[PDB]
Design a protein that fits this description.
It is classed as cell adhesion. The chain is mainly beta. The chain has no helices and 18 strands. The protein has a six-stranded mixed beta sheet with strand order 1-9-8-3-4-5, with no helix packed on it.
Amino acid sequence: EVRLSVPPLVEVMRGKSVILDCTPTGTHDHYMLEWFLTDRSGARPRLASAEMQGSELQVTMHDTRGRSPPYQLDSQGRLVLAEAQVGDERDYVCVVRAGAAGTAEATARLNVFAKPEATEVSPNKGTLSVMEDSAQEIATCNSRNGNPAPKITWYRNGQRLEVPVEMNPEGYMTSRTVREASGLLSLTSTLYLRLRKDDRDASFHCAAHYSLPEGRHGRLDSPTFHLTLHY
């Protein structure tokens, strides 16, 4: 009987190409491979159909949808995604129809990684004072246009600050994630700290930690800044 197994997870960097496997075993002369997208609804939009018999391949593209560049199939009927983009991050189903030999299907997740832009930081130059009795708004950090979402941490004198997200009198960091119109993700974080006199001499920066294929990570540091203190 026909059987089909594929890698359940494929990862690619934004802009690079990938070919999703669909190599069944147990087929007879004549079979068809069909590619679909799918989501949590189980709806299955058709992308392409390939029919193989002996010395002929037949291909019908179906997407409409309008990807740029278009999907393609290779000579073995596999799905080719040239120049992967965040929109291509989803699950793909290959179904093989093999006549008397039966049918089988297999799903793969494609994850697409986009490194965010250079981390930007915007210190509060208007109101900070080492004489102000509250946790003050120190600075805002922006890490834009990545996938998946980056995470931001803050530093003082080269040391990571362990601040929670919950508001309190001593220090905390807030964050917001936004989905850009492109589908990419941007994070903003604002640091709040109770200041001490010696903060006048401290350097600060934030860093965006981003994920990469194969369990890897990178870090993008903001420029370092010193506080502008008002007396």
